[PDB]
């Protein structure tokens, strides 16, 4: 079930992308909550040092609701302080190795006008791009990636891969691109609960995707 | 013999770093027979002919918009990338100097003795080597090799002091280098 | 503060090319064009990093074709030979029968073609010898280092013999432990 839920939650469902939401300043040290109209959204985290600074404030949110349709909206992390923007969106510079063959990517499809952006936002965008172009998780909506085959559990040409966030002046970190957890979004999306924020101008991505027989 | 004329083409992609990766400049250069003909400089943002011979290339490459986009992103994906990849064993490479003092095998200056402080095997190249006589620095009568690169990721330097050795005197060579918290000292007694 | 240079060249009619990375004057790595492999300057470098050798070979192919373009565009203007400056030194002070290494440093020359021979007492010596590739300089001439491990003795006399087209005769550079 991890395969269909990884594909669906990352690439089929619309991500959350809202600017200028005001956290409600509630007692919880593991949750932020904002009005989104008639309903409210809750961002769960495990990082009080980070999150205490966002309590009560105007935040921009971006990521994936782990509950999915028909349930209440909950997500992991995804928050940044509103009001700090670049003059235009920054295309994130990317090295990508496909089965070991390198190329450079620069696309508006993976970009941000946020001075400070979440690793989640970038990683979601990366993943939606890679699915569209390389059919990474199987059954994409574009028909591209024909040439990689369908041998993986995903019905695609790939079952291995990582995104490294190569930061200029902090310690670098990587996410596994094909990690499913115990199978449900509330498990594999948990990697995002730290609400990791990076300076959008001060990094690049080194991305690898491949197939292990 | 083979005295046929030679024709040489050199390429250099240079990443210049200032304050770590804080400020980076990429300079891509084409060099024909030791003369640079065309370059991309990231502070300009396009190709420019350096000589008339490279003018066709600047014009051609400047019309390829995907190419210029790649070169502009290259300060991150290439320069800052390779910096990071090699950082641990290049930027942060630390090798401690081996310090010795010896009187010269020549003493051609009558009763003026020559004392050599040899500082070898170290990395990086930033080093300070000071001579002391009785705890007081000697600036005069000092002659140096300057920094010598061995080509194997180590440097050496030799600092020679001329002095008249009087009995009781303590001569000290003192080395400060990034590989050590506190100065390295070698003592020589007259 | 730091400079990393990826430096390649192609040379005709010798049909020889090289691909290397330089960090602050020292070689990180080069590609062996014959073996199609990455050769680290210090072996331990290879434990922490990798480079795909085939990318060097692809770049060299383009360099070769471009050299031919420039040879014609210049109306067959050839290079002016610039002779090397040669220096023999050791890597550390020399002590009687304590292993050391003789360095023959060849500098400020172009084109990048040399024949280097170490001689001990007139006779050629190959035991344990090694050398760098052609290293860049900011004036676009080349540097190269050759190495001979040796056991210091009072009776031996060494020469580094360097041949380059810019030179009027082979350069013999003497070294002895006295």
């Amino acid at each position: 079930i991890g395969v269909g839920n990884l594909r669906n939650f990352y690439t089929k469902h619309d991500y959350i992308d809202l600017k200028g939401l005001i956290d409600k300043n509630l007692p919880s040290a593991n949750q932020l909550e904002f009005s989104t109209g008639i309903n409210d959204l809750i961002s769960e985290s495990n990082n009080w040092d980070e999150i205490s600074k966002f309590k009560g404030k105007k935040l921009d949110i971006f990521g994936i609701d782990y509950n999915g349709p028909c349930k209440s909206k909950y997500m992991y992390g995804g928050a940044t302080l509103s009001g700090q923007y670049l003059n235009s969106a920054r295309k994130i510079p990317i090295n990508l190795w496909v089965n070991g063959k390198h190329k450079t990517i620069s696309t508006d499809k993976i970009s941000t006008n946020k001075k400070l952006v979440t690793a989640q936002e970038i990683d979601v965008k990366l993943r939606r791009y890679l699915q569209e172009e390389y059919n990474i998780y199987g059954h994409n909506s574009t028909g591209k990636g024909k040439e990689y085959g369908y041998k993986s559990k995903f019905y695609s040409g790939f079952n291995k891969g990582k995104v490294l966030f190569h930061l200029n002046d902090e310690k670098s970190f990587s996410y596994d691109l094909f990690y499913t957890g115990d199978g449900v979004p509330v498990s594999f999306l948990k990697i995002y609960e730290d609400n990791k924020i990076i300076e959008s101008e001060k990094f690049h991505l080194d991305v690898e995707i491949s197939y292990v027989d | 013999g083979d005295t046929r004329p030679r024709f040489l083409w050199q390429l250099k992609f240079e990443c210049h770093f200032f304050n770590g990766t804080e400020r980076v400049r990429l300079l891509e250069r084409c060099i024909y027979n030791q003369e640079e003909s065309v370059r991309f400089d990231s502070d300009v943002g396009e190709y420019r002919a350096v000589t008339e011979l490279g003018r066709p290339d600047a014009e051609y490459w400047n019309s390829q918009k995907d190419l210029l986009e790649q070169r502009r992103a290259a300060v991150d994906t290439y320069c800052r990338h390779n910096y990071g990849v090699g950082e641990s064993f290049t930027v942060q490479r630390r090798v401690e100097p081996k310090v010795t003092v010896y009187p010269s095998k020549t003493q051609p200056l009558q009763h003026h003795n020559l004392l050599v402080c040899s500082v070898s095997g170290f990395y990086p190249g930033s080093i300070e080597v000071r001579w002391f006589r009785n705890g007081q620095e000697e600036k005069a009568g000092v002659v140096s090799t300057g920094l010598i690169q061995n080509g194997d990721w180590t440097f050496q330097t030799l600092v020679m002091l001329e002095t008249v050795p009087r009995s009781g005197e303590v001569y000290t060579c003192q080395v400060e280098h990034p590989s050590v918290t506190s100065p390295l000292t070698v003592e020589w007694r007259a | 503060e730091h400079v990393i240079i990826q430096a390649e060249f192609y040379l005709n009619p010798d049909q020889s090319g090289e691909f290397m990375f330089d960090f602050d004057g020292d070689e990180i790595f080069h590609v062996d064009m014959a073996k199609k492999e990455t050769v680290w300057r210090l072996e331990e470098f290879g434990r922490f990093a990798s480079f795909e050798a085939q990318g060097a070979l692809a770049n060299i192919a383009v360099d070769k074709a471009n050299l031919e373009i420039m040879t014609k565009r210049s109306n067959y203007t050839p290079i002016t030979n610039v002779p090397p400056e040669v220096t023999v030194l050791t890597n550390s002070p020399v002590e009687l029968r304590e292993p050391n290494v003789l360095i023959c440093f060849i500098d400020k020359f172009t084109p990048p073609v040399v024949n280097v021979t170490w001689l001990r007492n007139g006779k050629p010596v190959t035991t344990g010898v090694s050398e760098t590739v052609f290293l860049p300089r900011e004036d676009h001439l080349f540097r190269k280092f050759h190495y001979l491990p040796f056991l210091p003795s009072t009776e031996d006399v060494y020469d580094c013999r360097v041949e380059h087209w810019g030179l009027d005769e082979p350069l013999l550079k003497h070294w002895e432990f006295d």
Partner: peptide, 13 residues
């Protein structure tokens, strides 16, 4: 961790 080269480009013809 992988070193990245810049591609050499074909000259104008």
């Amino acid at each position: 961790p992988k070193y990245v080269k810049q591609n050499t480009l074909k000259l104008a013809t």
